[PDB]
RNA sequence: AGAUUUGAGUAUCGUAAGAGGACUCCCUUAACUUAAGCAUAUCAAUAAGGGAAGGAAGAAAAAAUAACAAUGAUUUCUUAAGUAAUGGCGAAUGAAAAAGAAAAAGACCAAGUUGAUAAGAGUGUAACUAAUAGAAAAGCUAUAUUUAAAAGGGAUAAUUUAAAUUGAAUUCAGAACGAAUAUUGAGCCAGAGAGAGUGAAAGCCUCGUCAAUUUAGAUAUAUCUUGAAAAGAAUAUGGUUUAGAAAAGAGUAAAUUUAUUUGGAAGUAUAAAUCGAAAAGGUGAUAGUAUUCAUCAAAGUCUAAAUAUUACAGGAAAACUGAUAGCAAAGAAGUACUGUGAAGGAAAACUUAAAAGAACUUUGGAAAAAGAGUGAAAAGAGCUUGAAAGAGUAAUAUGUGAACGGAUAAUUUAUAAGAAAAAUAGUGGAAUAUGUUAUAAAUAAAGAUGUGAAAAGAUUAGAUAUAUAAGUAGUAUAUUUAAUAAGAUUAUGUUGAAAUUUAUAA
RNA sequence: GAAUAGCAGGAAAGCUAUAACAUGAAGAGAAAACGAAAAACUAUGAGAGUGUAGAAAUACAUUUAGCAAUAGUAUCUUUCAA
RNA sequence: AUAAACAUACUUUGAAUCGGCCAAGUCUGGUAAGCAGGACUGGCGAUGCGGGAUGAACCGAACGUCGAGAUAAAGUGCCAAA
RNA sequence: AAAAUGAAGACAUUUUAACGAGUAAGGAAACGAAAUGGCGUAAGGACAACAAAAGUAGUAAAGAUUUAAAGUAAUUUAGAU
RNA sequence: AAGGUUCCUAAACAACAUUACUUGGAUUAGGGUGAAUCGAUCCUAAAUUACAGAUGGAAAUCCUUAAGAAA
RNA sequence: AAAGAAUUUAAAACAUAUUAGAUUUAUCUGAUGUGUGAGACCGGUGAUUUCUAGUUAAUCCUUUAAUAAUAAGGCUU
RNA sequence: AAUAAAAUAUUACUUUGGAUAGUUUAGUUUCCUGGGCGAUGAAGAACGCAAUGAAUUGCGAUAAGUGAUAGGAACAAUAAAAUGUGAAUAUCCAAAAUUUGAAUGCUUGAAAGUAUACUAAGGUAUAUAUGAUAUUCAAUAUCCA
């Protein structure tokens, strides 16, 4: 759940401001993620797309790679070379593609991406030392309490407790009086249909026994 | 708004013109002009008595029939006919008054935690039904903003020294948490049906006692409130019968007697 | 039912709703907080008298008034310029009501006064007054044998009696012990009228941790709890007849307008 | 609750519950208390037969502050202390202790006889007695006490 | 000639105006309406008209309540209360003290005193000045009590405000689609499962959200420093030598009259005409005189905080409307259009994922049509769906001054009911019934009465430390010592109800 | 859920507040001034037993109980007047 | 004598209504009226069905959906069942 | 209306008897033997594959036009386009 | 006066001028209005409005050379 | 004539007496005593209420701090 | 007696119309924070400015924009030029800010205009009321040589 006041989750606002953001703000939007190659040699998930930048497409009909030739922050689309269409009469015209369906290849970087690509960078490592220090606390604190235990056994197989010991309530007497007429045949339905479901089942175990 | 549809000069035009009596737009220029007016009937004119904003919204109830609601609130509870009627998935469970160790919950601060808390004493069945049937809204609400709905699940109540352990529970889908003391039928029976599953932990469990007292004790966290006696002390209407058949009081059941067709006794022999 | 309704007039532009009542508890909560975090104790709400209330209907209802009387200061051995500064309200404006009321309001303030730390105006500890509460200490504990044991002589019987008349309800839980401390009590009270203190006692100036209190009047309470009062039944209470006393009070009042017609006659 | 009204069940009868012959017009004789002594007056009458003119005198500025005199009758005394105490004491008599019921304490100025005491001893402080109230007290052997 | 008084012109430095008026303070003698008519009354400090301000404004420190075991500036809320009262005593109108809370704060003029009096005032600046309420000046004193070099600079910390930065986990695999977020399978994150976008439904694609970081802005927030810690200064109750032997708001309060207003009724408030005080006096609401009592001390000024807000601006929310709705306005809406003018004042949402918005031929004067083509689909721009009213085409049926409907049949058309199987005699037990055993589950206790432990405390009496000390078991805090009385809560004995009903296997 | 003051959670929701007051426990009188028992009575009435019988259910006789309600009363508070 | 236990006695809250019209082995004003106004009852209003050809009131008879049978008013040359 | 039975069947229980016209008007909800029974529009809170993937939906939603079925009716249900 | 580009030219005819239009005061696009002597500007007529003054609760009204150290 | 302890330590109004400083005026302004105004009795005093018999007075209710004579308002007819 | 042109009835398809269904960059209400205009010329009005604009939007003779600070590669209907030696974009900043308007030298109807002083053209100042200071005066108004 969202705790901030200042930001508002309203649909109709948040699409207004979509639709009046500046060009400023349309580019940060306009992001694709680095390819597998790519991610390993700079450390960073995803970057804003720019010109001259390669793709991939990943979704749609064709899946071609191809240079980015137009980033068009109005329509918050972009477009290939590969990807045309001819337009009846034999002339072509370049189809828009969303950015957040294609992956980055290969980047145009001049001066500032080294910026950028560094600066993603330790953003990165410095939260990763953050959330490392974060879950040595709470392992610090589970072993306080259950030192024969680890805390590995949280990502593993959970095995139910299997005792069902029975609790006497004057009240179990009354449950089928205390329903509405509507939910007392729903859960006398229920009994009856789960009973005929274990009925069968008796019946057809005593014939592989056979 | 208290001027919509009442921003107009509009007159009646009288009799003799063979249109009807109900005011017109007053000018020349526009379609607007001598058309319908304010009335509820027309177009573009105010509505049938316009709603206000002083209206009625919050209601009163009486504090005792409040605390008189929660206690067979958290009594139905315990009741897993009842419990499973309200749509709780409750047959792996070991126990339905649940109340886990109150050390157990003092290590929780992880989300992954918190879940393998629920998979431990079975209530992930719950859990995982709301997971599995979250649906969208049908209608115009979408439009306001509501659109995803989801279902109830478990109900974690807790108290005082269990507060670190809240951050953990609340992203989980449909797992609802409360303390002990801030219940209310909000929680207890939402929709209106009773007997929400609910999971208590050691120290909220506890308190319970001093909470409500008991029905010869009055309670010390609601002053002036004790739990009630039911019309009837044992509802059961089986030991009155077996007292009287055994003190021989009851008459033999009867069946009525197969009642006679009427016949003609002039031709009818028989 | 004859219905009155003062709805004739517009009733519609006179409507106030209080949707701005769950906002108004946040935001006067919110200043309460931040007057203590400013300077604590001027939220603490400055210590006030226990005044009763007013007509014969409430008059035994004690309620908290509005600043001390300038007699009730005198009385405590107060500055009433020092008095504003420390958490005391001051009402000259008030006139006193009664011995009773000077009393118990007196007794108010030297309750407050032991109570109050008064940390030194400059922080540094060669403050003047930290200082010169260092040079009259030997004069303080010279001064302090005098007081201690001359009030060790002078409440020897009294303190002995009350330890009698003490035990005395004890083993009885007594006519002897009580007539005794009473004759005791005469004399004493008699012994003082037969006598120049202080004009203002010290203020208790010194240097402690800072334990912040919201308020005073709630720590000196108004009134003492009140438990089932019973009492000794003797016959001068059973011939008392409460409806022939009253009735005399209300026939000698209507009475005084024939008294005064006569004369004139 | 609207869908409970009387208009859910009236919809389809063109006159909605109020007659065709007699409608169901603006006024049905005046706005509020009009013609309390002309063509209402048979109602005035009826049920309020004492509603015009005048009786008693003026007060031009009353202090019903002055009135103020709550009252309890002597059959209501005991219970301002409790049946524990009432008992604790029942066996008591002029000598030794005996509870003292003050009631301006608990609010009450007044106190009236009506009903029984128990057969115990009591000594009852009040603002005001009644005649038959002291009787009783006194009877029972107890004593009445004044305040203020 | 000179000294003044008053009034002007000019120069310099400033100040007012206009916009807005939701909330704030006021001026003004509306009416419709109600009274079943109507004339006082009601609507009603209401509408319109007029003036003035601020982020709030107004009020504010008793010529106040009350008749008490008394209170104590102003403001706002609860209650008093539809009460006292007012009213063709009709319709109707209608408070306040007490009591419970939010917030809290008090100060100055004038008059009096001091006069080798102080570029401007001497027709007076300045200084002192009140509940022990005959003050006020200069100088010695006493006793209690307050006190660090004020203000202003600089630094850190803390609290808030704004911005920026950062902010996990499937770029997973298969099947199918024009397209995957959907579907199947296997996983992971979560103090993040608020939300938006994405060829289509996304916790793990992008932006974001939870948890955070950094930098700036304010505090009358604390610390350290400049800053020495001195000399002194200050409150109050007195003594003494001189000085002095006071003042406290006037066309005001009040009175006669008129008019409006008020719950205020032999006058609650304001104003006008006349009248007009004081070796003071006002009020205690039934007019008058007298004597007591109580409580205040008018006729000058300022004052934060708690309270209001449908202007306007910036945000957040919604059991609100969903294009005849919701603002008049979801598009170049107070726009188009009307009037000389004040003014009046609308209608109109949607192709597709992407224009890929047919593009070349034949007929035609052209518009267009027929092919062709794009697209998942013409959805073809009068473009999502496409109802009724009204037409056109096709199929079928009927017929002399209305037509339509109902019951009953006939004709035509349509819908629409099935694959099992006999008698007698050998063979067969296969569903089931009776009742015997074994096992399983379910069904009985609501209470009554014994014995303990006990946190937080409370009371009482000692001890220590600090502060204060009034001559009334000294007080207050903290740590402890011992005891009484109760104790929320909590533990465990005794008693007291079975023998039946279903289920399974023989 | 009188204002209002606190709690956790961040919350127009929820919970807690020995509490002013509202209605009621006492009524009459314009007001001053007052302020309720013979620990009630009478009538009819709801219920519970026992016996006999028909004989299936059910009908008769007798002992006891006296609620609600209605009416009538003695007594008591206030008023010129109940 | 007869009838009456879904009898009897009600209590509370409230709707609509108080323009009426017709018949007659009845009356009053009037020359009289399908005129005006009354006493008692039954109707129409609020009511369809079978008959009077047709008709608010006349005659029979008052209505859940139907099958068969006797009937009511009144009919039995044809319309039209007899 | 009266008898009988009664934790859940089901058709709002079984049997018997009487009854059923109607303008203005009345019969709010709930009430196991139910103090009339129901249909429809929209919105809010819950329930909807009980073994850990839990109502329907690009293997076609809502809407529209018709064909048939259920209900005394208000309306509901399903097929085709 | 009023209108306001309706003037001229070229292209073009879907709509408009109760048939039609190759025409148009209609559609599209360009072009066009030259002053020492003609007028406004200047003067005053009926009348109109300012500073100061007078009046009014107010908005504002009066006065036009009378009231003014003004013009 | 008969029944009655009466509650428990912080004080200002000044009616006054006496001085001190001033003034002549309808004269005042400070401070020191006293009572007032005080209330803690030792079975018995008794403050206090009641009863009787006289005698003096006042008497239908209200004008809300207390009375008085006028005035006004109540209640019944 | 006869025909089915017209007329009527049902269904399918097309048409006129735009209901219904799905949808929302628009409103409504409540609450929170402010409530920050003007002689240093406001609000309002008019006119003008884009490579191709009529409205609208932004702006003011420096014109759909200039400088500076952040910002990092676009815009697009069609052309051009400029551009990592810094394009879009943002700003409580700087420069600049036509005619009017309280409108204020005088006049203003739809009026074109115009006087003086200071610094031919251009730019500043000059309204009314008003506080303080300086200065020039008026009045035998009070004294007075």
Known sequence: ???????????????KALYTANASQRALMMSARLSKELREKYNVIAIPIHKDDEVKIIKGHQKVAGKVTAVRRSKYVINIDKLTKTKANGQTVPIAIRPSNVIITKLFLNKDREALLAKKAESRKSYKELVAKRNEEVAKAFTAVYPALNMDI???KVEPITEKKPIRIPSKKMAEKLMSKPTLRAYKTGIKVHKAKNAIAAYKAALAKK | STEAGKQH????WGTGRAVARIPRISGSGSGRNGQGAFGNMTRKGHMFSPLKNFRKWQRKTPKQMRRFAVASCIAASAVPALVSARGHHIAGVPQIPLVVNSKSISVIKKTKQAVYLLKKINAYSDVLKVI??????????????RKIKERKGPLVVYGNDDLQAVKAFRNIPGVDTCRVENLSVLNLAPGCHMGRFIIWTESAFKKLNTIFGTQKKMAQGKSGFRIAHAQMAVPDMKRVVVAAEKAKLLRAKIVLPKVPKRANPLKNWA | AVSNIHFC?????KVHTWFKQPFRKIRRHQTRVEKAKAVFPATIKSLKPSVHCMNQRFNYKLRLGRGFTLKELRAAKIDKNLARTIGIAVDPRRKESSKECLNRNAQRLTEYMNRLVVLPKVHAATAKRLVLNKKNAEAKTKKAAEIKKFIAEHNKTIKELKIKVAAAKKDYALKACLKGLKKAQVAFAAQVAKKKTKQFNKLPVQQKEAKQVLDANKVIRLTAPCTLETKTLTKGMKAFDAVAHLRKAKNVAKAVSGIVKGQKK | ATRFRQTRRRRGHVSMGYGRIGKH???????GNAGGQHHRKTWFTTFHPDYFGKHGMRVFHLKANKYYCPSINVDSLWSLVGKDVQAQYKNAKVGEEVPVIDCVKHGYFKVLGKGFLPKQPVIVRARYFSEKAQQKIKAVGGACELTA
Do not use: E, H, L, Y
């Open chain 1, 154 to 156: 949280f990502g593993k």
């Open chain 2, 9 to 12: 000069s509009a007159i009646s």
């Open chain 3, 9 to 13: 007039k517009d009733w519609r532009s």
């Open chain 2, 132 to 145: 599995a049937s979250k649906t969208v809204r049908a209608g115009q609400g979408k439009m306001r903003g």
């Open chain 4, 25 to 31: 017009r603006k006024q049905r004789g005046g706005r």
């Open chain 1, 1 to 15: 759940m969202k705790f901030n006041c200042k930001v508002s989750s309203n649909p109709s606002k948040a699409r």
